[PDB]
Each structure stands twice: as structure tokens, then as C-alpha cells.
Scaffold this active site. Sequence first.
Site, PDB file in Angstrom:
ATOM      1  N   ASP A  57      -1.228   9.230  13.078  1.00  0.00           N
ATOM      2  CA  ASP A  57       0.090   9.752  12.686  1.00  0.00           C
ATOM      3  C   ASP A  57       0.586  10.839  13.644  1.00  0.00           C
ATOM      4  O   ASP A  57       0.873  11.977  13.254  1.00  0.00           O
ATOM      5  CB  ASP A  57       0.074  10.263  11.239  1.00  0.00           C
ATOM      6  CG  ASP A  57       0.264   9.157  10.223  1.00  0.00           C
ATOM      7  OD1 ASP A  57       0.281   7.975  10.618  1.00  0.00           O
ATOM      8  OD2 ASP A  57       0.389   9.474   9.023  1.00  0.00           O
TER       9      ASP A  57
ATOM     10  N   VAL B 152       4.223  -0.673   4.342  1.00  0.00           N
ATOM     11  CA  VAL B 152       2.865  -0.957   4.802  1.00  0.00           C
ATOM     12  C   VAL B 152       2.171  -1.891   3.815  1.00  0.00           C
ATOM     13  O   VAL B 152       2.299  -1.726   2.596  1.00  0.00           O
ATOM     14  CB  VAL B 152       2.040   0.334   4.980  1.00  0.00           C
ATOM     15  CG1 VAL B 152       0.628   0.021   5.499  1.00  0.00           C
ATOM     16  CG2 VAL B 152       2.758   1.303   5.917  1.00  0.00           C
TER      17      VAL B 152
ATOM     18  N   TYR C 273      10.350   5.251   6.844  1.00  0.00           N
ATOM     19  CA  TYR C 273      10.332   4.744   8.212  1.00  0.00           C
ATOM     20  C   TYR C 273       9.658   3.372   8.299  1.00  0.00           C
ATOM     21  O   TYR C 273       9.657   2.737   9.357  1.00  0.00           O
ATOM     22  CB  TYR C 273       9.627   5.735   9.140  1.00  0.00           C
TER      23      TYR C 273
ATOM     24  N   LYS D 256       2.406  -2.649   9.359  1.00  0.00           N
ATOM     25  CA  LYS D 256       3.615  -1.868   9.085  1.00  0.00           C
ATOM     26  C   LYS D 256       4.846  -2.623   9.578  1.00  0.00           C
ATOM     27  O   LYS D 256       4.934  -2.962  10.766  1.00  0.00           O
ATOM     28  CB  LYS D 256       3.545  -0.485   9.740  1.00  0.00           C
ATOM     29  CG  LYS D 256       4.816   0.354   9.489  1.00  0.00           C
ATOM     30  CD  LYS D 256       4.615   1.839   9.776  1.00  0.00           C
ATOM     31  CE  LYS D 256       4.470   2.116  11.267  1.00  0.00           C
ATOM     32  NZ  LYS D 256       4.346   3.583  11.539  1.00  0.00           N
TER      33      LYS D 256
ATOM     34  N   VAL E 220       0.840  -1.192   0.000  1.00  0.00           N
ATOM     35  CA  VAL E 220       0.000   0.000   0.000  1.00  0.00           C
ATOM     36  C   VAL E 220       0.879   1.247   0.000  1.00  0.00           C
ATOM     37  O   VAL E 220       0.560   2.245  -0.658  1.00  0.00           O
ATOM     38  CB  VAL E 220      -0.961  -0.024   1.203  1.00  0.00           C
ATOM     39  CG1 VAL E 220      -1.372   1.382   1.608  1.00  0.00           C
ATOM     40  CG2 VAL E 220      -2.183  -0.870   0.875  1.00  0.00           C
ATOM     41  N   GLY E 221       1.998   1.193   0.715  1.00  0.00           N
ATOM     42  CA  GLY E 221       2.882   2.344   0.791  1.00  0.00           C
ATOM     43  C   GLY E 221       4.229   1.951   1.351  1.00  0.00           C
ATOM     44  O   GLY E 221       4.410   0.858   1.894  1.00  0.00           O
ATOM     45  N   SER E 222       5.180   2.869   1.209  1.00  0.00           N
ATOM     46  CA  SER E 222       6.539   2.651   1.693  1.00  0.00           C
ATOM     47  C   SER E 222       7.263   3.977   1.920  1.00  0.00           C
ATOM     48  O   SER E 222       7.224   4.872   1.074  1.00  0.00           O
ATOM     49  CB  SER E 222       7.326   1.783   0.707  1.00  0.00           C
TER      50      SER E 222
HETATM   51  C1  LXS Z   1      -1.976   2.753   5.023  1.00  0.00           C
HETATM   52  C2  LXS Z   1      -3.150   3.061   5.959  1.00  0.00           C
HETATM   53  N1  LXS Z   1      -2.759   3.377   7.362  1.00  0.00           N
HETATM   54  C3  LXS Z   1      -3.494   2.952   8.485  1.00  0.00           C
HETATM   55  O1  LXS Z   1      -4.516   2.298   8.422  1.00  0.00           O
HETATM   56  C4  LXS Z   1      -2.772   3.467   9.747  1.00  0.00           C
HETATM   57  N2  LXS Z   1      -1.617   4.224   9.187  1.00  0.00           N
HETATM   58  C5  LXS Z   1      -0.492   4.662  10.021  1.00  0.00           C
HETATM   59  C6  LXS Z   1      -0.693   4.695  11.588  1.00  0.00           C
HETATM   60  O2  LXS Z   1      -0.768   6.013  12.082  1.00  0.00           O
HETATM   61  C7  LXS Z   1       0.692   4.112  12.070  1.00  0.00           C
HETATM   62  O3  LXS Z   1       1.555   4.403  10.964  1.00  0.00           O
HETATM   63  C8  LXS Z   1       0.813   3.780   9.912  1.00  0.00           C
HETATM   64  C9  LXS Z   1       0.527   2.409  10.503  1.00  0.00           C
HETATM   65  C10 LXS Z   1       0.325   1.156   9.968  1.00  0.00           C
HETATM   66  C11 LXS Z   1       0.113   0.083  10.876  1.00  0.00           C
HETATM   67  C12 LXS Z   1       0.115   0.291  12.242  1.00  0.00           C
HETATM   68  C13 LXS Z   1       0.321   1.580  12.785  1.00  0.00           C
HETATM   69  C14 LXS Z   1       0.514   2.616  11.904  1.00  0.00           C
HETATM   70  C15 LXS Z   1      -1.617   4.158   7.774  1.00  0.00           C
HETATM   71  O4  LXS Z   1      -0.798   4.677   7.035  1.00  0.00           O
HETATM   72 MG    MG Z   2       0.252  11.155   7.737  1.00  0.00          MG
END
Ligand code: LXS
Ligand code: MG
Length: 344
Positions: free
Chosen positions: A161, A33, A30, A48, A27-29
Site C-alpha cells: 500500500d 477486491v 479506488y 483488484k 473481500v473489500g471495496s
Molecule cells: C485484500 C488483501 N490485499 C492484498 O493481498 C494486497 N492488497 C493491496 C495491494 O497493496 C494493492 O492494493 C491492494 C491490491 C489488490 C490486488 C493487487 C494489488 C493491490 C490488499 O488489500
Molecule cells: Mg492499507
Amino acid sequence: ERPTFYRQELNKTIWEVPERYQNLSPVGSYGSVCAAFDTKTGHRVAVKKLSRPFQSIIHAKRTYRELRLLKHMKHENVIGLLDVFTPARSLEEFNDVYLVTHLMGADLNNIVQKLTDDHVQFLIYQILRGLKYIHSADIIHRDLKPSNLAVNEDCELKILDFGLAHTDDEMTGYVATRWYRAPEIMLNWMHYNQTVDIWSVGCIMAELLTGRTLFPGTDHIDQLKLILRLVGTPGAELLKKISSESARNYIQSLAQMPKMNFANVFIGANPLAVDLLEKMLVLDSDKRITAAQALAHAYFAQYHDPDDEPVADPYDQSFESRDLLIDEWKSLTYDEVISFVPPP
Ligand SMILES: CCN1C(=O)CN([C@H]2[C@H](O)[C@@H]3O[C@H]2c2ccccc23)C1=O
Ligand SMILES: [Mg+2]
Ligand SMILES: [Cl-]
Ligand SMILES: [Cl-]
Ligand SMILES: [Cl-]
Ligand SMILES: [Cl-]
Ligand SMILES: [Cl-]
Ligand SMILES: [Cl-]
């Protein structure tokens, strides 16, 4: 006790996760995800994988900070932690950290559509409800903006976030990364506190009412000029509170300006919304309305319930002034991973 893990390569990265998590898709890429389906709870989730979590003292401490914050947050309008795991079987082989939360779809940008005043009331009410909880634990979010607010089809909202402490380049120029920041932190005027988050709420509320960014500055100084045109140049009382002598000197080079009439800026808005904006967008942070005070404002009369606006358990942040080695931060993080207890 320990679940069975399985491995797979997802866009140049090896992911090793418990069997409960299925149908992983990037879905995305610290960190990287993935979206997944959690067969234990039935939820779609975000997973993540932290990248290089223990590569330096600074990075190891940031990993511990994020895990401590996410484990504490238990509120309807704040992101919560569904799971945290590592495939390591001991501290000696501990290298990777994975975090799991509910999968978020749209953010406030993906709606900011045609909003009624009733929509604005409900959205801002929920931000302030979550902020009352956050601030009661002496946590400062620091990075509130529309892309950090998740919203569903039923107009229900969650804050995410949290600011884990952005670069100089990230804040430079015509960028949304700076448009919602309070002036005292944008320009390092003074030691800041939780009142910075209320300035951001004012900026978000204004944009929901007008459809336009309130202070879209092309750089730090252009943005300050837009701010002072609306709220007025500072008086002697606030100037005394600016610890930087050079910043004080620059402010006094500007011609003085009065605060504008907000009813003539936010044309046609609910007079109660105008009143609340005047109480949020105050230059002197000591004089801004707090989240707990704002929930009692007449603009939210349809939603306010003082028996359903909870506060947080105490949150111990003494680690933030502690000096430790990489392996000591790593051991503290490992203990927090293995002591996690999932929500009901
Ligand atoms: C791509 C969609 N999405 C989310 O649903 C939650 N989120 C961000 C959360 O704030 C925190 O960083 C990311 C993340 C992923 C897993 C666990 C914790 C976290 C994020 O980017
Ligand atoms: Mg953000
Ligand atoms: Cl499992
Ligand atoms: Cl959540
Ligand atoms: Cl590992
Ligand atoms: Cl944004
Ligand atoms: Cl506390
Ligand atoms: Cl604590």
C-alpha cells in the site's frame, strides 16, 4: 495468445477475468477486491478491479503511477505484481484494469500476541531491508504503518500500500492515519524526502516494544506536543530549515523542552533497541539514520548479511512532472498492461 475470459456479477459489479482465476469471493471495496485461486501458479491471490480509472486527468495519472510502481517492485520484503490484465482487445475499447498479487492474511496489527525481543529484531530488520531497496530507486513510501505491513505464520513480512498521493478529512482527529507520520510532512514544514519513512519505522518499533501507540494525538497540534515532549523542541539550526514563516512562528510560541531519557521511557528494553530508537526519532530529518546505515546497527547482528540486502534497478519518474491529456495517460497505461511479463 490471449486467454479466454468469463463474466460474473459480484455485489453489483461485473467482473470479467481469465479462466485461470477461480472461486472469486469479495473481500473489500479506488477499487473493489476479491480473493481467488490461481490455477496456473497454485497461489491464493487478491484481484483488484480499479474503479473509474480514467475519469479525470488526475485519476488517469494515478492509475499509470500505481501500475508503474507495482511493475517495478521485485524484492522479498515488498509486494510484487503477479499479473495485470484487461478484457479489451484494442486501445479503442480499453476501459478496465485488473491487478493481481499474492493474497495477504494478517497485518502487523493482527499480531501486535506476546512478542519477544527476537521477534522485534526480525520484524524491524525486514522492514529496513525492504526500505533499503525502495529508497535505492528514489521511491518514498510515505504511508508506513502497521496496517500496511503483511506478516505470515513464520514472521515473514512484506511492505504494501504505497502512498499514491490522503484527504484532509482522513488525517483529522484521533486517527491512526496520522500517528505514524513525520512532523515535517504532518505540518508541511518543508520539502520532504525519503527520511520521512525512517520516522515511521521508529514509531512502529516503539509500539512493538511497548504494545502502545507512541504518539496517539487527538489532532495535529496535540500530536506535535507529544512529539516535542519526547524528542525536545527545535534548535535554531532546524528552525532555519522550516520554510513556512507561520509554522516557524507557532513553534517559537512553545516553551522550550529538553529531549527525554529514552531508557526511562522504554523501561526494560534491550539497550541496543533504545540506541536505535534514538537514532531514528530525530526531529531534524537531515540527521536521522538511513535504512542502509540501520541494517549495520548491532541490534540486528543475528540477521544482517550485507551480501543478501539487494538494491533496486533504476526507476524513471520523469512522468511525474509531465502534463498530458486523459487519453494520453490512458494510452501509456495500455502499453504497460500489454508489455507485462510475469515473474518466473
Ligand atoms: C485484500 C488483501 N490485499 C492484498 O493481498 C494486497 N492488497 C493491496 C495491494 O497493496 C494493492 O492494493 C491492494 C491490491 C489488490 C490486488 C493487487 C494489488 C493491490 C490488499 O488489500
Ligand atoms: Mg492499507
Ligand atoms: Cl486463463
Ligand atoms: Cl509478493
Ligand atoms: Cl476493458
Ligand atoms: Cl495502522
Ligand atoms: Cl532511480
Ligand atoms: Cl524505469
